[PDB]
């Protein structure tokens, strides 16, 4: 009896999820940041973000197809964090470092916060 | 941005598996013989060519129940489902032929290749 672990499977799935997202397949939510719209899978959001996890665990909010993020959240930093959720890659530049950390703190992605803090420190 | 955080994909899959066991946002029942397996369509689709084709056909895309072909055995399907959500494929001499046959059906060819090696080791 063997329990075989496939070590790039998790990477393969997340990659596929991203492919479904870029074709807009089975995306079941629109996140509204200021007034820009991002389509996403609820399940991915919850799997990465303490905020979205909190929200969608509420059996009431669970079938909401629209979510209005707080208005201090800028769309640029959100889009970067959405890309990270889906790619495990974080586009960090001096120009965006601050908007990314604030958005991450807000989404409760604390490992993203702490790599932003590590970045800050050239 | 050159750096990827490979464990992230693993966190993501770990949390999707959590949602599944809590039955949060599961949106399909897969029916295998007379056995029901709750799941998320996105995850099935990201893991199986067959599921990708089913959930991408508009006549099938919007049903909460999907029946697999009658020949498919429930023990085999349960192992593949666990694999999709954990990356671990649990093979036993008691389950192997049905896992192979079920993985072939689901067009999961790397899992098929690993079953053949186990039978050769057995
Ligand atoms: C890593 O990704 C692979 C599958 C993952 O696994 C699955 C389970 O998750 C998927 C995800 C998340 C997807 O988004 C698609 C598919 C699958 C899976 O199957 C597809 N699967 C088929 C569905 C069933 N058969 C086809 C047959 C029955 C007609 C197999 C593929 N088509 C598929 C699609 N779209 C298309 O075909 C279209 C509109 C265009 C394709 C253009 C080129 C030709 C490709 O892009 C090529 C350069 C390469 O990228 C793919 C061929 C790649 O294959 C690999 C590993 O080289 C898959 C996308 C998809 O968008």
Numbering used by the authors:
A (entry chain A): 6 to 127
B (entry chain B): 7 to 128
Could you give the paper's own sentences about this structure?
BCL6 is a transcriptional repressor that accomplishes its effects by binding to DNA through carboxy-terminal zinc fingers and recruitment of co-repressors to its mid-portion and amino-terminus. Co-repressors NCoR (NCOR1), BCoR (BCOR) and SMRT (NCOR2), which are components of multi-protein complexes that include histone deacetylases, associate with the amino-terminal POZ domain. Work by others has demonstrated that the important interactions of BCL6 with co-repressors occur through the amino-terminal POZ domain, which also mediates homodimerisation. BCL6 is involved in chromosomal translocations in ∼25% of all cases of diffuse large B-cell lymphoma (DLBCL) and is, therefore, likely to have a major role in driving lymphomagenesis.
Here we report the identification of a direct interaction between the BCL6 POZ domain and members of the ansamycin antibiotic family: rifamycin SV and rifabutin. By plotting the chemical shift change (δΔ) of the most shifted peak, as a function of rifabutin concentration it was possible to estimate the Kd of the interaction as being in the order of ∼1 mM. To explore further the atomic details of the interaction we crystallized the BCL6-POZ domain in complex with rifabutin. Despite the BCL6-POZ domain being a symmetrical dimer only one molecule of rifabutin is present per dimer. The rifabutin is located at the dimer interface and binds to the surface that overlaps the surface bound by the SMRT and NCoR peptides. The napthoquinone ring of rifabutin occupies the pocket, which is occupied by the residues histidine1426 of SMRT, histidine1352 of NCoR, or tryptophan509 of BCOR, in the three POZ domain co-repressor structures. The most important interaction appears to be a π-stacking interaction with the aromatic ring of tyrosine58 of the BCL6-POZ domain. The aliphatic “handle” or macrocycle of rifabutin makes electrostatic interactions with asparagine21 and arginine24. Specifically apolar interactions with tyrosine58 and electrostatic interactions with asparagine21 and arginine24 are involved in the binding of all three molecules. The binding of rifabutin to the BCL6 POZ domain also appears very similar to that of the small molecule, 79–6.
